[PDB]
Structure formats: C-alpha cells, structure tokens
Design a protein around this nucleic acid. Structure first.
Lengths: 406, 540
RNA sequence: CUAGCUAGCAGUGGCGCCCGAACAGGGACUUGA
C-alpha cells in the first residue's frame, strides 16, 4: 500500500483541546473496543512524546447494542480544509434532491482496511479519560484511516468508485454521494424496488467484508412553508398589533410590503379587547400581503464559497422551527419540526437539519442553539446517533422569533 | 535497567543553546567534585566532553536541614527551545470519590528519577561542566520540563504487567505515591505487597489516618485535617499569605466560608510589616472558628449502591447541595451562589445548580445521581414548556421542606376584559441625560415625571413602573422597546439592577397583568402621542 | 537577561501585579424605516 502524502498547513499546529469528562459505563465500552482495535493493529499505545490531543466519546448506535467510537475532528478539518478542498475534491450533483427514496449507509469498515501515513499519525493521537483522574490517560495512536476526518473519503474515493463501478453500470438512475463516512443512494423507484436495490448494494459492499446492518428518508416531502397569517372574522386590537409587528419585521424579507392602510384603523387611541371593523382597503392590502407571502422570496441563491448558518428556535410542546441562510435575512430554506426529555428532540431536529443540508448542498452548516453551553456540552452525548461532529455555537434568541409561528 | 525508553525529539529548526558558566566561588567546588564522582561511580552520569560544543548552567545551594551542599542544574534556556510534551496530569482527585478497601496501605519510591534511563541520542543536551571537566547525564535529570510526564509514563508502563497479573487490586497511582488497597486478609495483603516489591525490584526500584496532600484517610471513613488559627493581633505578609491559603483550602469543603473580608482588607499591601486594622474581620474569623470547631466526616463511595442528591435554598440567591447514599450519611457538601447572568430567578438558578452537580458527579463518580428537588412537577413542566430556551434535568422527586421553590407571578397571552390601555415610551439626549416618561389611559389619567442621569432603557423601566404604580387590579401594558419585554418575560426575582427588583416587587402584588409589543414610530394608538409629549425640546 | 564595580535554580500549593482568552454594560463606520 502506498499512502498518499498528507500534510498540514504552515502557521497552524495540530489540535490540543482538552477532553471533557465521561461516564464509567462508557469507559467500559471504550476499553472493550480499543483492546480489540489494538489487537487488530488499528491503534497502538504511545507516551507523552506528542502533545497533540483530540477528545473521544461514545454513543449508543441504533439497530444493535454496540458502542461505535467517534472522534470530533472539527479542529483538524478546519485546519486542513484546503487539502481536500482544492487538492482532490468531489463535486455535488443536483439530481439526488429530486428522487423518491434515499437510504443512509456507512462505509467505516472500508476505511478500517487502509494504512495511514506514518509522518501523519502524530496528529491523530486520541486519548480516553479516566475516573477521578486516578489512573493516567491511556493514550493511543491511529494506524488506519479514522472516521470523522473528511480527508479519508477524499483519498478513498478512487477505490470506492472502482469497487462500485461493476454494479452501477446496469443502474444508470442510481446516484452515489459520499461527503463523509456516510453514504447516500439516489433512487426514484417504489419502496419494494428500493428495498431490493439497497439490499443488493448491501451484498455488493459486504462482498469485501463490510459489516453493515432517519434510515430511509424522502426528499419529495420537503416543500417551502412560508409565513402564514390567521384569517378570522374577529379582529381585535391585539391581533392587528401582532399583525403589523410581524409584517414590519418581514418587510426586510418581503420588500414590496407597506403599512399604509393598516396604520389608519388603529390611529384612534382606544382599548385592546374591542373589535374594529376592517375596511375593504385594509382587507385589500391584507389579501395582497397574503398572496405575496405564499410566493417564494426570490433573489436568494446558494453561494458555494461562503459558510452556512442554520438557526433553530423552540416555540413549545415540541414546536421546533428552523431557518437556513447564508446572509442575514436572506433565507434559503425554512420548515417545521414537531410531534416526535428536552434535549432528545433538539438533537433529532439538528440531525434532520444537517442531513437535509448535506443531501441538498453538501456542507455542514454552523448552528446557533438556544441552550446554555454547559448543559448541552454535558448532555449532547445521550441521544446522538450520528458518526461525525458538526460546528455550532451558543447564542440566545430575541423575543420576536417566538411570534414567527403560532 | 532494561525498561524501554521513550523517543525524544527537538523543536524543528533548533539546537542546543550554549551557556557561559558564571565563574563561581571556591567554597562550593569540593562538594561538587565529590558529588559528581559519587554519581559517576554509580554509572548514571558519564563524562565524555572532548568536542561537544554545548553547556548548561550549574548552581549550588544549601537548603533546610543543613548537613552538606548539593548541586543544582537549571534549564531556563534549554526547556524553552525543547519541543513541547503532553502533560497527563490535569487535575486533582477527591477523597469522597474512592472505594471501600479493608486492607489499605501506602507506598512511595524516593529518588526514583535516577532509576529511569534516557534516550542516548537526546543525551547530547546534558552538558554538565564545572571548573575544567564536563559530564553528561545518562538518566532523567531534575528540573526537566518533561520529567514528571516521562516519569509517570514509565511508571504506568512498568506497573501495567502487575495490573495484568492481578486485575482485582485497586491501585491509585500518583507522582511518587502508590495508593494500593484491596479486601484481603493481613497475610494475603502482605503477600501481595511483597509480590509488588519483587515486581518493582525486577527493574531495580527502591521499595521501603493517612496523609494525602493534607487529607485524612481513615480505614472506615475520611475527613479533612483540622486546621487551627493563631490568636495574635499583627499579621505579616507571610502570615497573610499563609492564613488566606488556609481559609481558601478550608472553604472548598466547608460552607459559609468566604474571602471577601480579607480580599477587601488586603488590597495594595505589598510590605511585610503592614499591620492591617476591624470588627468585620474579627466576626468572620470567629465564624470560621465556630464552623471549624466541629470537623465534618465523609464516607467512601460505594459502587454497588446508588447515590441521591438534594439541594436546599438558604436565602439571598444562595443554595447549598448535599450528596448521600444513606439517610443522614452525607458524602460531601458545598454551596453555589454565582449570579450567572444579569437577570436570574429561582428555576434558572436551580437548573444551573443541578447541571453543576451532575458535572461534578460525572467528573468524580462517573455517573448521574437521583435528585430530591424541593419543587413541584406541574410547576416545572409549565415553566420549561412556557420558556424560550431548552432546559432538561434527570429524574427527580419532591421533598416538603421550607423554603419552597415557587413562582411569585405568571404571565398571559391575551388581554382581559375591563382592563386599561397603557402606551409608554421615553428617552433622553446622549449628553444631557435628562429625560422624562409618560403614558396614556382611557379615562385620561396620565402622569409625566422627569429623570436625572438616566438612559432610554431605564426611562422605559421607570415609565412601566409608574404605570403599574397607579394601575387598578387588572391592567394591560404595551411598549416598544424589546429590552423591557425580554426583562419582564423572563420573570426574574433577583437582578443586579435594583430598579427591576422594585418593579417586580410592585408587580407581584397585582393579580393579573398582560404585556404586548408594538413597533415604535408608526403611529399606533398612543405611542406617537406619548412620544410627542415626551420629546419636548429633545427631538430637534 | 535580572538586582545593589559585585551577587544572581527549578517544580508543587497559596495569596498578591500586567497582558491575552470567554459573559454582561457605553461610543464610531455601514445599511433601511
């Protein structure tokens, strides 16, 4: 095997971020898996000769009781982006977002069968924590391609396509996209045909020893849901006040919106519980705003160079809303998420959001979660079922987005 | 010493920094000569310096217990150019986070830094000379930047076979202490100790309540060392540093012990004779005495049984926590009173406390304990369902004990019949800082009051304050500044700014209240009216 | 290089000075109502 020479970027060193504590029940599975991975030659123990360190935690994967370990390569990826971005990359087709069915696949077993460069192993050193800091950290060092660092698919795509060619020729309508260790398939057939094809692909992948046991998503059910206004015969002063506030805020989104007729009925200083007769002119402007609202906001494109921002908020009773935009007020895609504990629903929502953004554009968007830093930092390993780590931050929300929806 | 060494490298584009050994005196040479010959005849320091163009500084000093002078080697310039190494040690353990070991013992290996070799290629940077003759270290030298890391790595790599041969022996390693214990008989315990001694001797290692960095470890319990306090008047700078260290190390476990009186009374003091003067310090030290008059005793963690947590409020935004497994058999205690954020309240502080406690349980015990919270289920569920953030706590239950954790008031989502409208606003110039605040009503009972040195936010706060002051029993208030909206919707109880505190104290006695929001400068009801009424000579 | 021609170690814990990194409050630049 001839490992492709991989290097870092001058000016920035490797990752040296600390490791948050874990639970002993997870440490049990960590030891029980790293012993096997070291006996298999995938890792080996080292000493303090390398100050580089990257945290490691474990999740409870679905469809089984195993504990697949994962490494948050956020810093490594952010510092080596240029390599897999301009040296050897993969474009993003547009046909997958128009098919009927899609099934998620994992090919980490394929990455676990290729050696890694010796001069690069000193940057992927991962350590496991210990209880009460009594026993020193049992350090290790990868010997094969890891899961989480997006350079491994960038260097494996050659053999990947070489292996998938024999079967993808007879299926011209199939689509294959691997932005990371995950693997998506493009199919626009019935559920039974898609089942047969996906089990055929499972056989094709297990032909080379790939132990592969949400799961099946549908992109056709993703329609843009614009702002909806209430339409009732009763129009109190509070209702029209909330309406004018909402439309004054949305004027940045919808340019051709005015408050000409609406600012006339409420001119008389009166109470709030009373009802005011809605004139036909204000009704005409309301109908105009209604028919413009359903029209998708034009002028919002997708920049393949800038970063992505996907804010998420909580309305209550699981009514989770989310907006994606590359620029302030330049929304690209909206939607709703409800009717699925308070952190499990949030993790499921951010998982769905990032999965949709990956299968649509193919770039992990930065998140803004409405939650304290310590609580989520400690409890985000409970129901997380993915294999990679996205970027995020901790910013609050203004008291206006609560009126974005009902 | 057939133990495997560690590969050592250097910073890229660097080399050994030369040093110009300062010519020292003569009353320190003979001892240096005898000690270097003594270390040379042992076989751990070689003298091969025929053409090596490197040098390191040499020092000598006679420390406490004056019997003889010893040598000293410094690497102020060598460690700087030396590449960085990983530091495994990053925290301190806890006495409560231990197990129940019937046959417990302690062991330390002194002068073990000489019993570990060093890489031959890296031995080129050990130029130890003296007026001439030069020597080179062959083992781990003292004061090295990566000395403790390499030492502990070698220790773990040499005790791992002993862990393999006997995985049922609890071992708490450290820098040099070997806290080993099990549940065997005295004979079997001594047999295991002798086997461990033979295992360490296989590589040539010296094998000779308890003391753990000042802690007391009894066979059946554990406690903190009973600290004392001098009863004099003057306190030098040494006495100051010592007493403040003592109270800091005592406050980490005992509650109600602070350092605000000493911090505030010991500002700017850089002298040694400075005699700081008061009754506050006297009463604080007497309270420290009273608290330290009875020592607390903890219990070792039991892996079999679970553990329960509980928190009780003490007043003025201060909350104390307890961790226990059996009734009244508490493991440890503490206090949490940090005002996280500008506006806090009861349930927010409770969530912060419970997250701190579960983080401490994870880092100490590696598990999540059950909580006994003094709050109701429906109140908490209504709170977290009617909040604009995400807050989750593990399973818990209710305990009836004052003071209860409740909500002083609530809010609504729609107006109420028979209420009254209130359009409030107000601002001031960025230089005069003299603004007013007014409002409107149906019956026409307005009231404008000027302010002094106030900001627009505080102007709106004062406006809604005076609005709720002369309101009826159920009124509705509408404003424009989202700052007051976010302040009121959070429903605080204790904030930094006393203004919002008096506002909430006046509002709590009201039974019902409804809030709204309208974009300003759009002519909505009385917004522009009160704006024109308050903008007299401040707009243009 | 530091301290008054002379003397000039490190690590662990503590309380004291300056800077940087996170949270909260005041001014300038740009874009709209």
């Amino acid at each position: 095997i001839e490992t492709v020479p991989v290097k870092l970027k001058p000016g920035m060193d490797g990752p040296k971020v600390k490791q948050w504590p874990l639970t002993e029940e997870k440490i049990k599975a960590l030891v029980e898996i790293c012993t096997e991975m070291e006996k298999e030659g995938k890792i080996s123990k080292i000493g303090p000769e390398n100050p580089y360190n990257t945290p490691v935690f474990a999740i409870k994967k679905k469809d089984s009781t195993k504990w697949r370990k994962l490494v948050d390569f956020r810093e490594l990826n952010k510092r080596t982006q240029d390599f897999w971005e301009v040296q050897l990359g993969i474009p993003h087709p547009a046909g997958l977002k128009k098919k009927k069915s899609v099934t998620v696949l994992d090919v980490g077993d394929a990455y676990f069968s290729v050696p890694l460069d010796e001069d690069f192993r000193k940057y992927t050193a991962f350590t496991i924590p210990s209880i009460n800091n009594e026993t020193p950290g049992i350090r290790y060092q990868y010997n094969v391609l890891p899961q989480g660092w997006k350079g491994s698919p960038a260097i494996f795509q050659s053999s990947m396509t070489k292996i998938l060619e024999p079967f993808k020729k007879q299926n011209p309508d199939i689509v294959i996209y691997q932005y990371m260790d995950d693997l998506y398939v493009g199919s626009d057939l019935e559920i039974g045909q898609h089942r047969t094809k996906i089990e055929e692909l499972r056989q094709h992948l297990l032909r080379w020893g790939l132990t592969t046991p949400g799961y099946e998503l549908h992109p056709d059910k993703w329609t843009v849901q614009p702002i909806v206004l209430p339409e009732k015969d009763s129009w109190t002063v509070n209702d029209i006040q909330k309406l004018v506030g909402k439309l004054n805020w949305a004027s940045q989104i919808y340019p051709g919106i005015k408050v000409r007729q609406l600012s006339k009925l409420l001119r008389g200083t009166k109470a709030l519980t009373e009802v005011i007769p809605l004139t036909e002119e204000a009704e005409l402007e309301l109908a105009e705003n209604r028919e413009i609202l359903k029209e998708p906001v034009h002028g919002v494109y997708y920049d393949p160079s800038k970063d992505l921002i996907a804010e998420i908020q909580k309305q209550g009773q699981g009514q989770w809303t989310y907006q994606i935009y590359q620029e302030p007020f330049k929304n690209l895609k909206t939607g709703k998420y409800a009717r699925m504990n308070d952190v499990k629903q949030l993790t499921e929502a951010v998982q769905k959001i990032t999965t949709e953004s990956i299968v649509i554009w193919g770039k992990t968007p930065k998140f803004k979660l409405p939650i304290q830093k310590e609580t989520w930092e400690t409890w985000w390993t409970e129901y997380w079922q993915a294999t990679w780590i996205p970027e995020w931050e901790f910013v609050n929300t203004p008291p206006l987005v609560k009126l974005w929806y009902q | 010493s057939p133990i495997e060494t560690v590969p050592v490298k250097l910073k890229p584009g660097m080399d050994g920094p030369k040093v110009k050994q300062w010519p020292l005196t003569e009353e320190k040479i003979k001892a240096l000569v005898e000690i270097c010959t003594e270390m040379e005849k042992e076989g751990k320091i070689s003298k091969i310096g025929p053409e090596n163009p490197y040098n390191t500084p040499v020092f000598a000093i006679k420390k406490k217990d004056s019997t003889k002078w010893r040598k000293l080697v410094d690497f102020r310039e060598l460690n700087k150019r030396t590449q960085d190494f990983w530091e495994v040690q990053l925290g301190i353990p806890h006495p409560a986070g231990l197990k129940k070991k019937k046959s417990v013992t302690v062991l330390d290996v002194g002068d073990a830094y000489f019993s570990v070799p060093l890489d031959e290629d890296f031995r080129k940077y050990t130029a130890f000379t003296i007026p001439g003759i030069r020597y080179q270290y062959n083992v781990l030298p003292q004061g090295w930047k990566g000395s403790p890391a390499i030492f502990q790595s070698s220790m773990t790599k040499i005790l791992e076979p002993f862990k393999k041969q006997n995985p049922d022996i609890v071992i708490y390693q450290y820098m040099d202490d070997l806290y080993v214990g099990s549940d065997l008989e005295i004979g079997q315990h001594r047999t295991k100790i002798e086997e461990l001694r033979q295992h360490l001797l296989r590589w040539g290692l010296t094998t000779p309540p308890f003391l753990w960095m000042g802690y007391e470890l009894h066979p059946d319990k554990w406690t903190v060392q009973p600290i004392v306090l001098p009863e004099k008047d003057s306190w030098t700078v040494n006495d100051i540093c010592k007493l403040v260290g003592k109270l800091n190390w005592a406050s980490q476990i005992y509650p109600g012990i602070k350092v605000r009186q000493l911090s505030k009374l010991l500002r700017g003091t850089k002298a040694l004779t400075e005699v700081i003067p008061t009754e506050e310090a006297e009463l604080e030290l007497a309270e420290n005495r009273e608290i330290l008059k009875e020592p607390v005793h903890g219990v070792y963690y039991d892996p079999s049984k679970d553990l329960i947590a509980e928190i009780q409020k003490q007043g003025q935004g201060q909350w104390t926590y307890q961790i226990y497994q059996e009734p009244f058999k508490n493991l440890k205690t503490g206090k949490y009173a940090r005002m996280r954020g500008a506006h806090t309240n009861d349930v927010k502080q409770l969530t912060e406390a419970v997250q701190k406690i579960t983080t401490e349980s994870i880092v100490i015990w590696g598990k999540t304990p059950k909580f006994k919270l003094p709050i109701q289920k429906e109140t908490w569920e209504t709170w977290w369902t009617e909040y604009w953030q995400a807050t989750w706590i593990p399973e818990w239950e209710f305990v009836n004990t004052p003071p209860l954790v409740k909500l002083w008031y609530q809010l609504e989502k729609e107006p109420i019949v028979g209420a009254e409208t209130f359009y409030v606003d107000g601002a001031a110039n960025r230089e005069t800082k003299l603004g007013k605040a007014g409002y409107v009503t149906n019956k026409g009972r307005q009231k404008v009051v000027p302010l002094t040195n106030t900001t627009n936010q505080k102007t709106q706060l004062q406006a809604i304050y005076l609005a709720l002051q002369d309101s009826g029993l159920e009124v509705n208030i509408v404003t424009d500044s989202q700052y007051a909206l976010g302040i009121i919707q959070a429903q605080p109880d204790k904030s930094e700014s006393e203004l919002v505190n008096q506002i909430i104290e006046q509002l709590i006695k009201k039974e019902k209240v409804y809030l709204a929001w309208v974009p300003a400068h759009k002519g909505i009801g009385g917004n522009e009216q009160v704006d024109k009424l308050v903008s007299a000579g401040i707009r243009k």
